[PDB]
Amino acid sequence: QSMEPAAVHYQPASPPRDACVYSSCYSEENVWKLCEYIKNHDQYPLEECYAVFISNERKMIPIWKQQARPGDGPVIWDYHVVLLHVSSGGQSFIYDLDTVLPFPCLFDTYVEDAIKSDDDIHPQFRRKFRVICADSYLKNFASDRSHMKDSSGNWREPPPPYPCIETGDSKMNLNDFISMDPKVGWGAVYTLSEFTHRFGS
Template sequence: MAEQLINTNKKIVNLFSKASDCSYVSCYCEENVWHLCKDIQERHVQEIQHCYVVFISNSSRTVPLWRQKSGRDEDKLVIWDYHVIMLYHPQPDRCLVFDLDSELPFPTYVHKYVTETFRTDHILKPDYFRYFRVITAEEFLQKFASDRRHMKRPDGTWIKPPPPYPAIGTAETTHNLDDFIQMDPGKGPGQVYNLTQFVQRFYRTSINS
């Protein structure tokens, strides 16, 4: 009971004053989120333990997300091969989503983000069901690496211009992005959820606490 009281009363820190202050390069969502986490680790070190990185994909690499800035229809629907967002979950009843590609406010409470961005799998064919690999921000900073090979054509030219800063690597590897994108629960870092499980983990837990 005492532990619950402490968690519930924990202050929600304003991690970023506005989205425009954050590092952002179009089509490099995993690196954008890495820099969000790195910034929190450097400026709000006590809050990094409450942050999570979420890779959204499926085996067919076709995940529909609504309210995305690059969407062209009225609902701003985009079908990504994968997407990456960050969650800040400092209290049992509070969880914020940081998505630099969303037209929703930055950040947005998870209940609004889930409702408007994911909607429901019931209207989708199975190939479009969304799955969610959830990793702590600390583990993500330690283990994630990308040499950006996925953004190069066979002739070596860029599909999209790369970020101006150096590629992200670790002492162990220069590239393991696919380990995070693939949604086999028995492989890769973190834990994989379907949409219902993800909602129960971060949304229903919040509203029922």
């Protein structure tokens, strides 16, 4: 036997998975919409929440436990975005609308099963994490979806059913979030081990 505050009665910050606004291959906007819900629902301080971009320099990251590939294999994304809630006791939860893990999922469980160790992964596939305060994300993110069009301008995947997210300052800055260069964009950039050291139990 081994003993471990525990958030055993944790109440989710979002509606259940199937009630959330969601478009396949627009995880940056799915997470934005979760941030918007949290802001307007007055249950948790927005400052407890973070958008988390996952990518790397070659824009090829494996993620396991993904709905797009049922089974034990990874999806190789160019980038993927999830929501992190650091609950007030310190236990973190991951909200990934694309995972087959629970929604939400305990942080440690998400990193062990969906992310896995980088130790034995070929180095050009290793994961980095850009962590942006949810308030800063809502204030600064903009995407005109121009990255989801083919060479003739037609959609590669159908867009979300609402107008493009834009700010007063920009209509497209998605590359500043996918970038893992800490000299670019908002928030903090972590290696996988730095990320787990910072938020893990």
